[PDB]
């Protein structure tokens, strides 16, 4: 199209300091102990140097595990400790409200050759996020007052639920699902599996510990049945009722 855009690519990483496994995380609850890093790969640079931009980007992705997973120790060495947070528990609202900082002041220094301030978030999830309630309220109230369009593009397949989906907890600890009206979700690309079961895709659980432990429940008496004919008639009579 022969455009003259001005790109600014920036990573945004959340590290989970706690040692608890990801399977033991309640849905709708944000990570308690977490650290937020930001790494700006390229500043305001026009797309005509795009090859160089992409070169930089590739290097900055291949040297992002060493910069974070290794930590400096005062004893005299490094420690390979630390784990990236998953997308569901990631700091998506913190990314959004970190992006809404270059446009906060209306009387900023003027870009005399560019006009719009479009923002794209590239996520490896499927539009499912766990957020805090107050942060969501503040994020919505801020985004309803500044000139930004946020196009979240997901690199995974479109899920069965509606996107974008935010799961949160109220003050009485009840799960609530909301779809924000300030985010536009795009997906980057018989039968296609739209649900993610990671442990069964990569065979991460072996044969002997994958066996079933809870079988069919034993039959029970109702304390009002006298004969086996009565029990059979009662089971056929209540075979289709839902409690």
């Amino acid at each position: 199209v022969d455009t003259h855009h001005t790109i600014t690519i920036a990573f945004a990483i959340s590290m989970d300091l706690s040692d608890t496994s990801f399977k033991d995380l309640t849905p709708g609850e944000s990570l308690k102990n977490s650290q937020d890093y930001f790494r700006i790969v390229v500043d305001q640079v026009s797309i005509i140097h795009w090859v160089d931009i992409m070169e930089t980007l590739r290097e900055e992705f291949m040297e992002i595990r060493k910069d974070l997973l290794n930590k400096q120790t005062d004893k005299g060495y490094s420690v390979a400790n630390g784990r990236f947070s998953p997308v569901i528990k990631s700091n998506f609202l913190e990314l959004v409200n970190f992006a809404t900082t270059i446009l906060t002041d209306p009387f900023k220094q003027l870009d005399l050759r560019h006009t719009t301030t479009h923002v794209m978030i590239i996520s490896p999830g499927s539009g499912l996020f766990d957020v805090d309630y107050s942060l969501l309220r503040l994020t919505g109230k801020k985004l309803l007052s500044l000139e930004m369009t946020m196009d979240l593009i997901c690199l995974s397949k479109a899920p069965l639920h509606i996107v974008p989906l935010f799961r949160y907890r109220d003050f009485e600890n009840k799960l609530h699902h909301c779809v924000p009206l300030w985010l536009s979700v795009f997906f980057w690309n018989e039968w296609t599996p739209r649900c993610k079961i990671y442990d069964l895709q990569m065979m991460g659980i072996t044969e002997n510990e994958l066996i079933r432990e809870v079988d069919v429940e034993y039959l029970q008496l109702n304390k009002k049945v006298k004969s086996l004919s009565e029990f059979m008639n009662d089971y056929d009579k209540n075979a289709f009722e839902v409690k």
Partner: protein, 405 residues
């Protein structure tokens, strides 16, 4: 299983000496095995109608897979640069899992060649260029050896590019004939497989899977639409974890199958059958009268073969009730073990045509179910009523007969 690669070679279009094998691992493998790069050279470096496509053909006993790439720019001589990373397999295998890896490798190297000319400048020959305006061999060796040994590779080729390949098996898509009257089992423990990335519906379906809950019951219990439950069950079938089964009643027509001899020829089937079908204690259900210490394997085999095509479970249980009381046998577990091992099956009941005032929607879905010859199970599920009420409603609607198939 995954087929090992036989020969991997990198082919390039030289503007003077033509298409040729620039590099090849193992060395002198094609000439030793009889493969000649003068018969299929027009498919490896094709005219730009077959380019950017996954050309897979057969040469003798070797299946050859390739993704030829042609780049059009005035920088290269003759306005084109053509290459191909060609993999050779034995014919008698399945080259399905390696095809996306070859396609993605070709696409990645095309992107790199368009970006910074990583493959054109590696030849160290200015004849490839207009002239008016990293080792490939080691990479091929690493790809060949790592894909033969580990089925994975993380081979670095530059400061920011790496050949990153994992080979996944191909799985059959699941059935589409899953309905509301089919109960799901679970051959795997679904509690320990749940992680943070699951679908929200598939989290809720998991607690209500115990071999006795119907899909409509799961949908109403977990507050879910039946369609998404159907899709989630299909996804679980896709990974070979969940297998469907029938709703257990006391009016069913269970019958022996052709695999009842597996209860004798399998050394580990009857021993688990003794422990499975027994109540943990002396249950009270084994003490109710008909009207008012583990079981022997011969007893269980005699009880399996006592079923017949027309003897409902009520009649069989009231015809054999001293045996199921002295031996302390749970009849539902007794039936479910036979259905799980495919030694007995269910003869479905079909109401083919020849009370409280139900509403208009119920009578509409009743007529729609009767017109489609649906079973008693689906009508009972949809109307949320047992078999007797459905039979009375149908007899009020018209004369009909029951087929036990």
């Amino acid at each position: 299983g995954f087929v090992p690669i036989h020969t991997i070679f990198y082919s390039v279009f030289h503007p003077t000496e033509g298409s040729k094998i620039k590099y090849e691992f193992p060395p002198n493998n094609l000439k030793n095995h009889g493969i000649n790069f003068n018969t299929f050279k027009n498919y490896i470096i094709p005219k730009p109608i077959l380019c950017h496509k996954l050309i897979t053909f057969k040469y003798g006993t070797y299946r050859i897979v390739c993704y030829p790439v042609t780049i059009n720019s005035p920088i290269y001589a003759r306005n084109f640069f053509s290459f191909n990373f060609v993999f050779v397999f034995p014919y008698d295998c399945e080259t399905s899992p390696y095809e996306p890896a070859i396609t993605r490798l070709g696409k990645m190297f095309k992107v790199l060649e368009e970006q910074n000319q990583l493959l054109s400048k590696s030849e160290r020959d200015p004849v490839f260029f207009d002239l008016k305006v990293f080792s490939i061999q080691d990479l091929l060796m690493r790809i060949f050896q790592d894909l033969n040994n580990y089925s994975e590779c993380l081979i670095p080729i530059d400061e920011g590019n790496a050949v990153d390949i994992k080979i996944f098996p191909l799985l059959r898509p699941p059935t589409t004939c899953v309905s509301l009257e089919d109960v799901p089992l679970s051959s795997v423990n679904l509690k320990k497989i749940i992680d943070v990335n699951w679908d929200p519906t598939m989290m809720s379906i998991v607690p209500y899977i115990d071999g006795l809950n119907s899909i409509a019951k799961i949908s109403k219990l977990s507050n879910s639409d039946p369609g998404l439950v159907i899709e989630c069950i299909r996804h679980l079938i896709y990974y070979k974890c969940v297998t469907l089964s029938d709703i257990f009643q006391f009016s069913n027509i269970y019958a022996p199958s052709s695999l009842i001899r597996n209860f004798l020829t399998d050394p580990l089937m009857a021993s688990d059958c003794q422990s499975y079908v027994t109540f943990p204690e002396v249950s009270k259900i084994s003490n109710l009268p008909l009207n008012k210490f583990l079981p022997t394997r011969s007893c269980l085999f005699d009880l399996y073969r006592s079923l017949s095509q027309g003897q409902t479970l009520k009649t069989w249980y009231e015809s054999k009730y001293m045996i199921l009381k002295e031996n302390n046998i749970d009849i539902r577990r007794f039936i479910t073990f036979g259905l799980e091992k495919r030694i007995i099956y269910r003869c479905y009941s079909f109401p083919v045509m020849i009370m409280p005032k139900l509403s208009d929607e119920e009578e509409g879905i009743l007529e729609e179910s009767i017109r489609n010859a649906e079973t008693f199970d689906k009508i009972c599920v949809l109307l949320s009523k047992p078999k007797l009420e459905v039979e009375s409603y149908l007899n009020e609607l018209g004369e009909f007969k029951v087929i036990n198939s």
